[PDB]
């Protein structure tokens, strides 16, 4: 037959059922000496009692109504998996037991309602899928059971495991985290959970630092290398797929270490689990976020869970163990002895001890969708079925291959007012709510809070809420925690890259002195604009500086006043010529080469004021010929009276001048000088300078003077004895000497450098050459003119010689 | 009772089989309108056939062994699969009918020769381990059947699979590729092994492009999907984990699309498929590098395959539908009518057209196993079995559990001297065979070359071997391809991140001014030390240079040439002053003071020496006062023989020299100059200089000169008119106007240069100075006391 322990009911309609009352069995590896034993079953699982009862609950509620099935009756038949394939195969092969008759006494099966791991469920699929038996699964929510291709007659009323596994990836990006690792249980659930997460965290740029595997039956070597691979690790979040019974001793392990500042990540699986919020594990496992599925309602069945009795539950062949396990005593068939009567609320086990209502409900829903298809089978109108020619089936020999097809094509209404259908896989789609994990003050166990919910039927993008302000880290924190590789980098300052390691592991580089950075986390530094320069601090770049010989500055304003001073002396020169003409002195020097030289003297100062400023196109173009041609005409009117014909001292003086005005006219139409920016000097700063655009007119200008000078001095060195007109041979020689010692001074300086210096050296040289040549001229004649010798050689003197 | 189409032999002993004699099953859209059928078979497989074959040969050798079971016989019920469960499963619970009637006329079943797919024989062992028969499988490799706590009762003669996709890993690594994609079936075998391929490759740092599965009855969207993924990657080498019946349809796909120049990584279920090693397909699949099992002998098998027959053949009941698919035609119990006298050499199949015998030779190894099993329990010796009390179990009631025992201690050796056993978990390990796919010259068909090995009894590092020359890359190349992400950078550039992109793909930067890198793939350009500089190419640092007025440089050597000139001048006037000493011209002025000048003079010349060199310290110290003495002694010298200067001639000198001296002591005490390399100026160049420490006591040594100069000078322009000594002050006041005019017109210079002209320009402005103070005074009085040896020493101004 099977195991002798089960739940049985007789009727005319039999429904199987597998649900684990056991959490496992017992760790026996037999050396085969002798025959083989069956295998013994550890804890009891009042969670799954409750599961069973669910099942019941419904049966019997079918069984009352009489707008179902009326003069038709549901019967059952369950058993105890224990999570284990090996028990359950057991159960399966008496399901299909009387069918296998025809095919290679116990009544037939109609459906079964399926299990609970994933593995068991692949297991009972396969031996069930044979036969066409209908299957209902209320917790299998593996990706591998939607392959309609293996599976021919699978269904579930619980999602599917993807939708989780990306909502586990939105919460991770939501709180900007970058750096996590990940555990999976090694089995059926938990791969294809942690393969579908890596697949979408890979894509929102998320670097998973480590990835393992864990049992039930692991070993101590095995949980001591998973918990140092935890330990040598720096992220703080960890993502699980797993179980209870799957994460126990890995869980026991962390707490008997102390380890301590984890983020856990929950699937559904385990987010609800007894076995792991426990009390005293609270430091290691405090401040949980996990999945949730939705709540149901069930009116009376809290009442019929209060009536459970070992003796009055005749169908009931797990309730002996129930009570024995709830009141540790002993039943006495006819630890101390079990009396019979005590009370259920006495003592507190999950049975009874809940809040919602989740697997339950789905173990009632699948009890309802196999009655509704039972019920759609007995309505049915003849030439209407689902048939070839539109024909019906009949009730009272129903198969289970009609009843498939009756359930493919389902479409109900629950007590709560929603639609049930099963889409082409045999899926149920619904929300999900996200919870947190909280302690009491008044009693110490822990509590689970919602604080967000995971919308499926939405836009990518706008599925998950969460209300922060509810969520408390670590189960005292209010502060978001830090699970980054590395710490951001800041304004000036860009990624570089360390070898071996991800993309999300990087050290902070400083950008260099011609590029910035003006945002976090820059690849590259930015070079910008060629009239800007980088701050000190590289978060921008400043504008650059114009250097010029400028007015308003204290050299040029000493410079100015200079040149101001040298005019008015001049002026005040030929003032005193004018006021003295008719007397003899004046007249023995030509009376009008005095005022043209004069002329000359203030073009002269009026030529250096043109240096003085920030250079123009216009500028540069009269500033260097505007002081050959009045230094040409001083050197012309100089040697003109020199010692060695009106009209012909008027001559020379028009000759010399119109050679250098020739000169320059060539110069100027051939190749204009212009203004040039100079930003090859230094990349700070810029220089505005003017460009000749030929050299060899500007050698030829000064070429012409220095010739001009040198045939005056040999000329004047030939007669420096005479002593006429006050010795005015020696006075031309040291106007001429001072002209050439100061231009070969000034030589270095044009040579080597090369800002507003050297602007101002040529201002000083051409001040300079002015005045030894005015002072040496003329303020020896000036002084005797008036002051002191007023009449004294005012005359005579001048009138002898 | 069961499936009707099987191969039986009655016995003692009844053995079970299982074996792939179809490809798979038909595509039946099921909709539920009827009592389901069973479905069907569709492709034969003529090696599935032989691997059939190879187990009857076994057995029927067993039977004719009179070593080995003596006085007992052996049977087998042997089922076909279809590469499906659910077909496995309808002979599974034949195996176990008798068991399970007493759990609760069929033989009993002992042992089972496990399936080829992973996926059904795991579905097949979570049914036998109820009852606990063995089972042996000859090519279940899926690394999730070594646990024992599920699979209690599962054995198998190959090895599994983390070996292959380590060695996946290490043939990438050797030939330096870090872009791969990977392609897996979507089954137990695919996936676990791409899984440990992925982790193998992080560990040696390989980036994955892509990671797709593929299925046998993937829809036309999928494919399409996957194509696309290939088709959009620039990653040329694919990594897959699948087997032909899973791979047809996307290399169908590729073909028809006609994408060339991959590069496949093969495993052993489909390295040597004949559904993908066609000739049609190898501008696509030319070349490919997968890998094989190690071979066995069989000394009588190929006589016993040239001797099947649909008539002579009872026990074997897939041999009409061999005959009729072999020769295409239809037996009597609109194709042509079959008889019994056709010859299978002529037709070419896999049935007798193969080189090596590598699975068979496994079905063949199964299968001695069980039968030493057997024997090892036959010979036991009371008080020394495997049970209890020592006791040994019985022959004519033997049981599957006590030959499950007895094969978890098994250890024989088989025909070719090697030694079997099973380990904890049930399993072997074996070497690997390297191949390379040719094509054939003459028949234009597909050549499985050997080109390498994988040792899996050595060290972690040494277990591979490749022979590269044997190797063509797309059955036509002998250069090795390029699957990398990006390109590498050059020697004076560095890598960039890009953003969004895993570490293998980068950007090259170049270095920039002052730092450097050498080696081929920086990550981090290197700033070399202080006193160098980069080069253009930012790939060697060099020195840079130290600037300094040298003494080997021509312009020191001139220099000093010109001071030498200056010294050996002064010591002829002072000789000729010495030979003359008494003399009318030497005695005219004080040739106490004469002596003196000379001197000094001397002094002053040397000072300039003192210029030219490398600075030091003390050098740079000694510079200014060395000049600045000597010239005021000078100064002072000439001063006290002007007109009207009333020994106290000689008190004066010393007393104005004194003054100079504590200045300059003054200065020294508090601050010291001291030299210096200064690196702000360039980049590229040190300078040596220095700093003159205080400015303020430079300004008092040079303005007291000045004002000593200038007092000479105005005493002696008041008197420049008396002709005494040859016009004595009409040559001082010229000496002055010498020196003033020098420095005022190196005034421009001197503060227009930094670098090392200064000291050049200091050297000169002494040297011209020293020179003319030289001349003016000595040169006339020389002029006629050279000469002239006596004619104006008489009456010179009256001597
Ligand atoms: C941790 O790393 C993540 C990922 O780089 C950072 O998230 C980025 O934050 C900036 C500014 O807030 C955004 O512009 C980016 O779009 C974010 N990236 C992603 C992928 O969302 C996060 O700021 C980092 N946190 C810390 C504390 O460094
Ligand atoms: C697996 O392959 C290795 C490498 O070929 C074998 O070791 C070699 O065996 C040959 C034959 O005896 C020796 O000549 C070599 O010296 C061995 N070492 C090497 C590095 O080649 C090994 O025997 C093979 N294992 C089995 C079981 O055949
Ligand atoms: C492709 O990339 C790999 C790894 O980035 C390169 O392998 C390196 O090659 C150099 C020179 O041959 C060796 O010094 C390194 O040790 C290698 N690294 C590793 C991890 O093996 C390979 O050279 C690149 N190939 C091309 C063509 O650029
Ligand atoms: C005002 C002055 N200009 C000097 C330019 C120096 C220069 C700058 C750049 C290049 C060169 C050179 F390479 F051409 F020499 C020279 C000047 C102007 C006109 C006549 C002059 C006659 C005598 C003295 C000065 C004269
Ligand atoms: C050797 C010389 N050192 C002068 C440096 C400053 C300077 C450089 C160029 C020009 C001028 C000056 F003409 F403005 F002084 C000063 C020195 C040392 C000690 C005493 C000196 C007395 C007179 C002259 C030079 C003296
Ligand atoms: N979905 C899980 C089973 C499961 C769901 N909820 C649970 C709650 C408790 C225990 C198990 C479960 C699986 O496939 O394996
Ligand atoms: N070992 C493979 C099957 C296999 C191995 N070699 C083969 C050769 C041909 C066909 C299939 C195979 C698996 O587990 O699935
Ligand atoms: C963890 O760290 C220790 C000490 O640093 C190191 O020796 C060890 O290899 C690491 N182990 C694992 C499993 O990461
Ligand atoms: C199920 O029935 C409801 C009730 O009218 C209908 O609105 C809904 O479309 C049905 N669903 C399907 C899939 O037919
Ligand atoms: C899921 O949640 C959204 C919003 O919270 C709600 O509108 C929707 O009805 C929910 N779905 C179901 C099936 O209850
Ligand atoms: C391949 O590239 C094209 C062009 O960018 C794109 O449209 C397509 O989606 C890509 N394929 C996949 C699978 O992303
Ligand atoms: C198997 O037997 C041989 C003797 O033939 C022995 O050398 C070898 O060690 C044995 N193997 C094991 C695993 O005991
Ligand atoms: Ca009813
Ligand atoms: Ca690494
Ligand atoms: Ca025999
Ligand atoms: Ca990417």
């Not at 284990?84 to 009387?98: D, H, M, P, R």
């Not at 792991?276 to 069945?301: E, R, S, W």
């Not at 990518?460 to 209010?478: A, D, M, P, T, V």
Request: glycine share 6%; net charge negative; hydrophobic share 40%.
């Amino acid at each position: 037959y099977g195991p002798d322990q089960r739940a049985q009911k007789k009727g005319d309609i039999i429904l199987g059922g597998l649900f684990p009352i056991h959490f496992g069995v017992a760790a026996k590896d037999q050396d085969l000496k002798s025959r083989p034993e069956s295998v013994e079953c550890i804890r009891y699982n009042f969670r799954g009692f409750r599961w069973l009862q669910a099942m019941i609950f419904a049966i019997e509620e079918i069984n009352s109504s009489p707008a179902l099935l009326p003069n038709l009756t549901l019967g059952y038949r369950i058993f105890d998996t224990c999570n284990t394939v090996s028990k359950a195969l057991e159960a399966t092969l008496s399901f299909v037991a009387q069918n296998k008759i025809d095919s290679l006494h116990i009544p037939s099966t109609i459906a079964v309602v399926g299990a609970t791991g994933s593995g068991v469920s692949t297991a009972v699929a396969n031996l069930l899928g044979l036969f066409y038996i209908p299957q209902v699964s209320y917790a299998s929510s593996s990706r591998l059971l939607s392959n309609k291709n293996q599976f021919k007659s699978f269904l579930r009323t619980i999602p599917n495991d993807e939708h989780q596994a990306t909502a586990m990836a939105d919460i991770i990006e939501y709180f900007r985290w970058n750096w996590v690792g990940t555990i999976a249980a090694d089995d059926d659930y938990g791969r294809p959970g942690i393969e579908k997460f890596r697949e979408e965290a890979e894509e929102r740029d998320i670097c998973i630092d480590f990835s393992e595997l864990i049992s039930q039956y692991s070993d101590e070597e095995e949980i001591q290398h998973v918990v140092e691979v935890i330990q040598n690790s720096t992220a703080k979040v960890i993502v699980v797929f797993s179980s209870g019974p799957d994460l126990e001793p890995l869980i026991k392990e962390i707490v008997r270490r102390n380890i301590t500042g984890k983020i856990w990540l929950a699937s559904e699986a385990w987010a609800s689990s007894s076995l792991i919020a426990m009390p005293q594990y609270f430091h290691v496992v405090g401040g949980t976020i996990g999945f949730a599925l939705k709540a149901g309602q069930i009116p009376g069945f809290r009442e019929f869970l209060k009536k459970v009795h070992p003796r009055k539950s005749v169908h009931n062949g797990f309730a002996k163990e129930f009570w024995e396990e709830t009141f540790n005593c002993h039943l006495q068939e006819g630890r101390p002895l079990c009396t019979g009567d005590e009370n259920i609320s006495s003592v507190e086990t999950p049975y009874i001890d809940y809040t919602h209502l989740r697997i339950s409900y789905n173990v009632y829903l699948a009890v309802y969708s196999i009655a509704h298809a039972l019920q759609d089978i007995y309505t049915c109108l003849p030439g209407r079925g689902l048939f070839t020619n539109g024909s019906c089936a009949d009730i009272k020999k129903v198969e289970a291959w009609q009843v498939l097809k009756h359930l493919r094509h389902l479409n109900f209404t629950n007590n709560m007012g929603e639609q049930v259908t099963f889409d082409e896989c045999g899926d149920l789609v619904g929300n999900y709510s996200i919870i947190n994990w909280h302690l009491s003050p008044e009693d110490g166990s822990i509590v689970f809070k919602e604080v967000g919910y995971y919308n499926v039927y939405a836009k990518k993008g706008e599925r998950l809420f969460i209300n922060e302000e509810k969520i408390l880290w670590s189960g005292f924190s209010r502060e978001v925690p830090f699970s980054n590789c590395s710490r951001d980098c800041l304004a000036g300052t860009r990624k570089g890259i360390i070898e071996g390691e991800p993309t999300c592991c990087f050290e902070c580089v400083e950008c260099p002195d011609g590029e910035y950075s003006d945002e976090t986390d820059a690849s590259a530094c930015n070079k910008c604009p060629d009239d800007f320069w980088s701050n000190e601090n590289h978060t921008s770049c400043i504008a650059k500086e114009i250097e010029f010989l400028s007015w308003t500055e204290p050299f040029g304003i000493a410079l100015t006043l200079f040149a101001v001073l040298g005019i008015f002396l001049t002026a005040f020169v030929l003032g005193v010529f004018i006021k003295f003409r008719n007397t003899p002195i004046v007249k023995a020097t030509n009376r009008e080469l005095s005022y043209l030289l004069l002329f000359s003297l203030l073009c002269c100062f009026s030529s250096s004021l043109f240096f003085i400023g920030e250079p123009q196109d216009w500028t540069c173009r009269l500033r260097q010929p505007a002081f050959g041609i009045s230094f040409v005409l001083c050197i012309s009117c100089i040697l003109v009276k020199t010692n060695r014909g009106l009209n012909l001292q008027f001559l020379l003086v028009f000759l010399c001048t119109f050679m250098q005005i020739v000169i320059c006219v060539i110069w100027l139409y051939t190749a204009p000088p212009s203004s040039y920016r100079n930003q090859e000097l230094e990349d700070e700063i810029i220089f505005i300078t003017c460009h000749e655009g030929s050299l060899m007119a500007l050698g030829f200008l000064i070429g012409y003077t220095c010739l001009l000078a040198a045939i005056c001095f040999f000329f004047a060195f030939k007669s420096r004895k005479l002593p006429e007109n006050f010795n005015e041979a020696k006075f031309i020689t040291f106007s001429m000497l001072i002209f050439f010692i100061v231009w070969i001074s000034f030589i270095p300086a044009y040579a080597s450098t090369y800002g507003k210096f050297v602007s101002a050296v040529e201002v000083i040289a051409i001040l300079a050459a002015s005045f030894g040549l005015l002072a040496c001229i003329f303020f020896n004649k000036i002084y005797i003119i008036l002051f002191k010798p007023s009449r004294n050689t005012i005359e005579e003197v001048r009138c002898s010689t």
